[PDB]
Amino acid sequence: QLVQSGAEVKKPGSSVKVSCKASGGTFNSYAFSWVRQAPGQGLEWMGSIIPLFGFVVYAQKFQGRVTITADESTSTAYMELSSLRSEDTAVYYCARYFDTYNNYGFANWGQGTLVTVSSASTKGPSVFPLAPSSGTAALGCLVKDYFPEPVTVSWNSGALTSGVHTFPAVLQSSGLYSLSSVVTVPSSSLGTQTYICNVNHKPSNTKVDKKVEPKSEF
Amino acid sequence: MQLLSGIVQQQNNLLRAIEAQQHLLQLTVWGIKQLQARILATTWMEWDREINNYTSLIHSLIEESQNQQEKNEQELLEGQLLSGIVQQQNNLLRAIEAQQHLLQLTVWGIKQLQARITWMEWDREINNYTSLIHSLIEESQNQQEKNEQELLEGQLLSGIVQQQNNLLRAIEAQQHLLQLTVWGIKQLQARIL
Amino acid sequence: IELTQPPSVSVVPGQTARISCSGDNIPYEYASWYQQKPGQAPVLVIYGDNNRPSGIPERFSGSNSGNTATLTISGTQAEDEADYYCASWDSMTVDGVFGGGTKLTVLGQPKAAPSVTLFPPSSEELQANKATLVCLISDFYPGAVTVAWKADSSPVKAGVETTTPSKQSNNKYAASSYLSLTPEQWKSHRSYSCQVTHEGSTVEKTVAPT
């Protein structure tokens, strides 16, 4: 029913136009709102458009900085937000109300579009081994100072699945992300099994293999 | 036989048309309130109360008509059928009456906003359909009275069938009225900002 | 116009949960309710005031006295754990507003202390002229935790970044904390520690320069 365009990464001051394609019904009988959600925060109503009339209405908070349009021939609603700043980082949903004559609630929602506003630029991670030491041991890989999300981590070319745990990224005050991935392994395997984390950061075309060896007892 | 089943069937269709029309009306009411805020055009507070009051009422009527439709259909699947079919015409007539008041309030809303921002053709069309509906509603009220009176004490079947034609004409005329108010809102929005 | 909900509500599984939403004048049929699970779109659960959409379990119900919308869930199940929002419209200017949301907790899952692992800086990083200690924190419930760092019995404020906890795969929580130092800073203290405090009890892991 409602499918939105994909994640956007934006510099402060610039613009973003988020689209939402509606299928399965008659476009002229729709009512649309835009709703944003900052990470860990509540839902927030931005504005509405009734496509049959084709004029948008806005919460004053967003007055003059958001433009809401609809296109009949593509069955698409749009939301443009200009002069971006960091506090604008949020997921944006298109939502549909007046499902039936008495449904004032929002019956259908798109998947959301992530908009990230940062002054940081695309950067590949530095990968460092987290060596196992002093009967299960933990070893890992520190994926440090990259932008943007996401990074993916496998172990031993995907052959190591059990005990893998990849932690969500910390956002540092430099605007760059760092992540860690650990595997729990049989202690007695450290001098025998070789362990290699495979790190993929697609945004900057980075593939890194890091061998994680046991700390020496010397 | 198939005469009464065919009447229950058409009443289902008519309630569906009223639901669909209510949906469009809702849209138009929303559109006017939205334009009211942007344009800034106390007398509007009382209009907003009448809108809300008659909108609740229409929702009640639609609901009660759904309940009566089901019972009527049960009675076929199973006197009380005739009774229910007549009650189902009174419910549809009431819905049409409340929707007509709603339409008239939306027309008023449009006129107020257009006296802030040709329309003579529109006016003429509004009046023609308003007068027609007023007259179809009045004929439906007289037939309902006649049919209720007979049901207490055929002529009944004839007026039941005639009441189906009345309701259908009124709805079809309301449809035209809706298209005109939609036109009016689109014509007003196209002029702001 | 503001909708206000309690930040949190907790229910024994099988008991009935109630989430209130107070406003000035919530007109009849204007109150709607939404279920939201981490990482997912909201889902309409009640509209009108007491209407459930197709596919919504019968144990969901709503009411509206004009001053308070209430969501009710009789016989609350595990899968009913989520954030709930109410929405409504301004009567005159038809703006939408949401309640602040309510975190509903279904009780039953046992307390679990965190498993914590602390790693020192690697050689390669120290050779790259940087030093970061890594504190991994997993397998805790409920999902609230506090992290403090110490260098030789003394608390360390600067260069600490910790994530806010996330739901794992089993229904436990994970978090990570990072302390940034220069190689010189690192090499001139007997030890550093990660202190993880969970439900008023603290787990400590210590690390020391080669």
Numbering used by the authors:
A (entry chain H): 3 to 52, 52A, 53 to 135, 141 to 224
B (entry chain A): 1 to 41, 48 to 84, 89 to 127, 137 to 172, 177 to 216
C (entry chain L): 2 to 211
Could you share sentences copied from the article?
During the fusion process, the conserved N-heptad repeat (N-HR) of gp41 in the form of a trimeric coiled-coil is accessible and presents an attractive target for the generation of broadly neutralizing antibodies. The 5-Helix construct comprises a single chain in which the N-HR trimeric coiled-coil is surrounded by only two C-HR helices, thereby exposing one face (comprising two N-HR helices) of the internal trimeric N-HR coiled-coil. Here we report the crystal structures of two affinity matured Fabs from this series (8066 and 8062), each complexed to 5-Helix. These Fabs represent the extremes of this series, since Fab 8066 was the most potent of the affinity matured Fabs, whereas Fab 8062 did not exhibit any detectable neutralization activity.
The KD values for the binding of Fab 8066, D5 (Fab and IgG) and Fab 8062 to 5-Helix are <<10 nM, 10–20 nM and ∼200 nM, respectively. Fab 8062, on the other hand, displays no neutralization activity towards these four strains. In the case of Fabs 8066 and 8062, the sequence of CDR-H2 diverged during affinity maturation, leading to a different conformation of this loop, as well as to variations of the interaction pattern in the two complexes. Some of the polar interactions in the Fab 8062 complex are lost, and compensated by additional hydrophobic interactions. For example, a hydrogen bond between Asn-58 of CDR-H2 and Gln-34 of the Na helix, present in the Fab 8066 complex, is substituted by hydrophobic interactions between the side chain of Val-58 of Fab 8062 and the same residue of 5-Helix (Gln-34). A hydrogen bond formed between the side chains of Thr-56 and Gln-34 of the Na helix in Fab 8066 complex is not found in the Fab 8062 complex, since the latter has a Phe in the corresponding position. In turn, the large Phe side chain is involved in extensive hydrophobic interactions between Fab 8062 and 5-Helix. Substitution of Thr-56 in Fab 8066 by Phe-56 in Fab-8062 results in shifting of the whole segment of the CDR-H2 loop out of the groove on the surface of the bundle, where it was docked in the Fab 8066 complex. In particular, the CDR-H2 of Fab 8066 is buried in the body of the bundle, whereas in the case of Fab 8062 it is barely touching its surface. In contrast, as a consequence of the different mode of binding of the CDR-H2 to the hydrophobic pocket on the surface of the N-HR trimer, binding of three molecules of Fab 8062 to the N-HR trimer may result in steric clash between adjacent Fab molecules involving the CDR-H2, CDR-L1, CDR-L3 loops and loop 71–78.
